[PDB]
Amino acid sequence: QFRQALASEHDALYNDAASPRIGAKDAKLVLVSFTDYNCPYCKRFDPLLEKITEQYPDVAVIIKPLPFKGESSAKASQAVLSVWKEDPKAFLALHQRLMQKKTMLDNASIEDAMKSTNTSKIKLTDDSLKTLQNNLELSRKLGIQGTPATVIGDTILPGAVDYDQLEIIVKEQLAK
C-alpha cells in the first residue's frame, strides 16, 4: 500500500499546475518537497533541494506547502501559492525569503517578506486554500506525518539529509 499509493497519487504529485516548481520543465527526475515555512529542518533542507536543481539541470523540485507547525504556516502557504498562480516567476524569491526567516512567522513577517520581494500587490486568494487542502489530502494518502518529506522516484525521504547524501540518492534515481 505504498508504491500503490504513489501510483494512485501520480497526478496530484506531479501534474498540479497550482503547485510551484523549481527547475527545468523537462527534468528527468522531479522531487516533490512537502515543506513547512516554520519548520527548522525545512529551513535547513530547502536550500539543498534548490542547490540540486542549480547544480544538476536534469532535476526539478515541486513545492507542496503544508501547515503543520502552526497557523502562520497556513498563511505563508497561502501567500506563495497565490504568488505562483499570478506570477510564477516571482515565487522563488518569496519562497527563499520566507524559508530563511529565523523567527516563527506571523502576518507582519509575511507581509514584510512580500513587500521586499515585490509581491505585496499580489492578493492572497481563497482559491489558493483549495491547493492547500489538496496538499493536506495528499499528505494523508502518502502517510506523511512530518516535514520535511521528499518524494524521490519510488521512495519517500522522511527527514533531512546532508548534501552529499542527497546527491547520492538523486543520482541513483536518475540511473533508472
Residue numbers in the entry: 46 to 221
Please share text taken word for word from the publication where this structure appeared.
Like DsbC, PmScsC is a protein disulfide isomerase with a thioredoxin-fold catalytic domain, redox-active cysteines and a redox-partner membrane protein (PmScsB) that reduces the active-site cysteines. Unlike DsbC, PmScsC is trimeric rather than dimeric. The native PmScsC protomer consists of an N-terminal trimerization stem with an 11-amino-acid flexible linker connected to a C-terminal thioredoxin-fold catalytic domain harbouring a CXXC active site. The region responsible for this conformational flexibility is an 11-amino-acid linker within the trimerization stem of the protein.
